[PDB]
Amino acid sequence: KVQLQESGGGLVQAGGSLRLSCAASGGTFSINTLGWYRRAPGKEREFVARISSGGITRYADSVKGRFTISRDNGKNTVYLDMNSLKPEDTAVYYCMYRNWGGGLDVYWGQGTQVTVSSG
Ligand SMILES: [Cl-]
Ligand SMILES: [Cl-]
Ligand SMILES: [Cl-]
Ligand code: NA
């Protein structure tokens, strides 16, 4: 019963910065965990980041020190601010909505491409 909408992403120069966002509706946003996974060309889908209802963050080692995840319960939106980007970050990024309220246990976004080019 939750719908997700991803925004942002696209082409960006190595070393540069890029924001992804994901907006949800239909659930109880304030109590749920939001995050991102990604699938890079060589690889299978992997955890990138998540943020609890209470603002507690977690990052995969691959992006720790470079990515910041945040949320605005006012707009039902989660943000992924990506910095120091490199070709290893080229991938399809999927929004994640881990549910503690009514509905399915988890919902996934359709995926947003991020492509890192030379600097
Ligand atoms: Cl929601
Ligand atoms: Cl997770
Ligand atoms: Cl962490
Ligand atoms: Na809200």
Numbering used by the authors: 1 to 119
The authors write:
To date, we have also been unable to generate crystals of mbp-NP600 or mbp-NP632, suggesting that our semi-synthetic sdAb had a chaperone effect on the ability of the C-terminal domain to crystallize for a protein refractory to crystallization by itself. X-ray diffraction data collection and statistics for the bound and unbound crystal structures for sdAb A–C are shown in Table 1. The electrostatic surface potentials of the undocked sdAb flipped 180° from binding NP give an epitope’s eye view of each paratope clearly showing the prominence of the hydrophobic CDR residues that engage the basin. Both sdAb A and C appear to exhibit the classical convex paratope, with relatively large contiguous regions of hydrophobicity, while sdAb B appears less pronounced.
